[PDB]
Symmetry: C3
Subunit: 404 residues, 3 copies
């Protein structure tokens, strides 16, 4: 723990004062592979640790639960993200980012995006080669197969024969072995988190960061201080009502938060998030369902970033942002949040479609050269949103746990 915190501070404040000194492209040839090494070795775990812990997590009460508890949190995930965009727009009207007239014109970003198929992405939730999907990544058709297997072995320990139930105990206990084998490594990769972390911010400061000034200084304030409010106004209040101690939650989830802010992957944070929930006394049927579906649908941090930026660009050109009917951001930023992907960046590239709905496309060359000011400093605002993106799952995971 302490080596991570001592590594994180002196890391950024080593890499910050090399950025003002023109060593951006030397902190690349030195510091930014060790941060990948930390990344790779978290990504290596993700596939077995989700599959084993989810064939085991269908051994507990099979109907309801994985469909009554699963619907509990479905109500939670939409309301949390729904409120997060209300917070971030009110923060962009308590602040005012965009008083300087958008400087450069030219160099337009993309334009002919196509999406969604919509129907043939809901059907792509159900796999065909259970072995293929499981071999690509695919952290959501892999879940669906695991639960439908785990139920099938529950009913198989009920049949009259012994050699029926005597091969099913073999199977399921063997798969349980890997489950234990995969939490077992996940702290032996934690291991090297101090030096991993020291690297990761040492870079993301020299290349972008020694950069923040002006109205980009005003907007970074409205991102972080808007994000602060989500932690202590929505979580420390909903944990406080639902029995659980506020501080005992954050004393335990500290090791998953740090590997979310520093890493910016929600997806490659997930084995260490899965362990932290076993550390605080959660039964498998809940957490190894609500965390993998959670790190792809509950995007609380992204909803505030997507709300506050679809307002910085309205101010930067001078659009009146609809006096009353700006709630058409409130529907779109939720529908973008659930859309938004795991790996870093993709929170902003889906910010494209929430600008599109209220009425400013990136075809217009002076809208999307002023989008180039924000996309210049994206990774900085990604560290922040990713922390809330991943803590918002864990908050609901234990608040649905102590209900059913």
């Amino acid at each position: 723990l302490q080596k991570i915190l001592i590594g994180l501070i002196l890391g950024a404040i080593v890499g910050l004062i090399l950025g003002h000194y023109g060593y951006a492209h030397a902190v690349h040839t030195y510091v930014k592979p060790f941060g990948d090494l930390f990344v790779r070795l978290l990504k290596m775990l993700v596939m077995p640790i989700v599959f084993a812990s989810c064939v085991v997590g269908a051994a507990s009460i099979s109907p309801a639960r994985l469909g009554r508890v699963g619907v509990k949190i479905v109500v939670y995930y939409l309301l949390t993200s729904a409120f997060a965009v209300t917070l971030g727009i009110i923060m962009a009207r308590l602040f005012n980012p965009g008083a300087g007239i958008h400087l450069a014109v030219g160099g337009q970003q993309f334009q002919p995006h196509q999406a969604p198929p919509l129907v043939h992405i809901l059907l792509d939730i159900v796999p065909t080669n259970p072995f293929g999907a499981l071999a690509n990544g695919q952290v959501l058709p892999t879940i669906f197969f695991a639960i439908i297997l785990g139920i099938a072995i529950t009913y198989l320990m009920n049949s009259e024969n012994e050699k029926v139930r005597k091969s099913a105990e073999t199977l399921l206990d063997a798969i349980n072995g890997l489950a234990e084998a995969m939490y077992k490594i996940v702290n032996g990769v934690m291991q090297y988190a101090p030096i991993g972390v020291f690297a990761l911010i040492a870079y993301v400061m020299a290349e972008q960061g020694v950069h923040v000034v002006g109205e980009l200084a005003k907007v970074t304030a409205a991102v972080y201080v808007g994000l602060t409010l989500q932690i202590l106004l929505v979580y420390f209040v909903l944990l406080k009502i639902y029995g659980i101690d506020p501080i005992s939650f954050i004393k335990h989830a500290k090791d998953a938060m740090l590997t979310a802010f520093v890493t910016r992957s929600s997806s490659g944070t997930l084995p260490v998030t899965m362990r932290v929930a076993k550390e605080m006394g959660i039964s498998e049927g809940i957490y190894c369902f609500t965390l993998p579906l959670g790190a792809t649908i509950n995007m609380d941090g992204t909803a505030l970033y997507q709300g506050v930026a679809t307002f910085f660009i309205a101010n930067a050109l001078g659009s009146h942002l609809t006096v009353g009917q700006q709630l058409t951001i409130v529907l779109t930023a939720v529908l973008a949040s659930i859309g938004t992907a795991g790996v870093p960046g993709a929170g902003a590239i889906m910010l494209a479609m929430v600008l599109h709905s209220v009425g400013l496309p990136l075809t217009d060359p002076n809208v999307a050269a002023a989008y180039a000011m924000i996309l210049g400093i994206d990774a900085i605002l990604d560290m922040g949103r990713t922390m809330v993106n991943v803590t918002g799952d864990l908050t609901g995971t234990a608040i649905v746990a102590k209900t059913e």
Copy 2:
């Protein structure tokens, strides 16, 4: 059984009178994903269910079964297919389709087709990375690896050490744990089958079907009544002679036919064709070899299709059918029946080579004017031809089971 017939007859009558009204592209975005939701769930099962029932399929008598019964089933397959094409000819010689001059000229199909290397597919029958080949569909190199491991485990249960035989007895009972667990899901997807087999056949009557008139009407009868003879002349005359009852047969095999007729996917209908054989007291060492090979090599209904169509297209111009030297269609159609793929569509697109053989290519852009009208009602003849394709499997899979 009942809601499948209730759903089938009122599926094919509801969509039928929506297809004389131009709602072809409307059933498209309403009743077409519901038929696919049923297909995807079935194709999900095909991959472990063939692997698990195959490691245990070489649990019982090792050579001579997969050895002398692996020769019996072969002789059965080449002869049921060759009788079938001849039965299609004297159907196109009792009915006569192709009177009028094939109307338009232009818009011709693909014309340079390469393959087969032949030598370089028979070597392709033996895999290199079993873990990937099994992750890539591949229901014929995956069968080779699954037998060859089962022989190995039989020989290890013979070793004198009790940590040689005490580690085999885990692996082999664990794989059986899936084989049981897989057949358990194979009815859980058959639950939704009425709504799946209301949605599929509702579509194949909206687009296409409300199209069968004129010359195509005369050939559609000469396909379906040719498909009737194979049932009550080759199955119901050979099932009768070999002990087993012909009426106890359709009492059991009417759970894979209904699926096969409607899906039109032989390889996507194998998991439930694998089960209805365990339902009627067929031992493992037979049915997990004689069906996966049967669902790609015994194409009984296609031989009759490629038989009758390689005669409609000769009639549509007027070529004299070779009045004495027409027995070279019969060799190509068998060598095309064995060639023809698992999934839908690939029968008529294989017809390319049996037309080519006798004289008339599809490069000639007046042959391709009449092929375009057959390929305009392919999906209707696709339903019937598939049912005899996978009935001729279950026919042999029970007759050869009662001899060895």
Copy 3:
């Protein structure tokens, strides 16, 4: 074994005399499958045999060993390679291949090869999706995951709960079943190895071989009499020094030296080399490590091929080869040896980059007009070179194990 020799002698001698009668493109479309059918069946095994024997090999003493060894073997590999290239020079300095002055000019090879990323390959040593790496070949990140597994099960067989270890033991024991079952086939594929051997070198004599004369005949000496030395000089001299009887070593490693010479794949040999290593009685947690890492780092044979050919080209035109300052071959070629792949061809295509170090690039249309003579007999020097590449692995695997 006697059938490999009776198949090998009149194997080459049968293929040879047909080559003087222009059946080059006739022995291609008749004999060369059966060689490949032997290759495919061996390459079938490489995947499970290197995965299983390597999880269980991490079950044996965990720190040091896989940490003290693998520091032992590593150094031995470097000093064998570095010796062999210097054995290579003083064989081409001992002969002198290259009096003929390059005949024509033209018909150039590739020229630009990009790579090395250099660091983004030492990072791709650690996998992401274990289930695909494994399903892709990849026998070095697959090594890395497996060692990291057995080390997790060791601790897991050390837990105080009889479900924490009563499940973990079941896992390791089913993985053990496959392990044993994979070796069990590796002589049942070593079965048809006399028709395997005869077909293979039947080809390699018809299309190439009937070419060797001139200074090609001269160089074909220095290469073969160089490789002869490395064994009865660095092995029969390091086996004698380290206990282990020489003549017993070559008695046992017979059925992996013939499978290596005839295949010319270091990768495609290994399952039946791993087995010979189990035969002489080496420990799991040694050979399951040292032969995987060895089939791609230790290339004693290619170290000699390269050294002698970076020298044929120099004489071919008539440069000095730098009078003393030539050991800039020795650093590069060992850096090139460790680079060189496991499948055939890769040696001479790497020989490029070492020639590029002494200052004769392949772009030069009279430089690589001599290089297209040496590629024209490369499958012939491949066989000799491959035998030493795999012998040098087994020699070290042995010496190292009798130390620790």
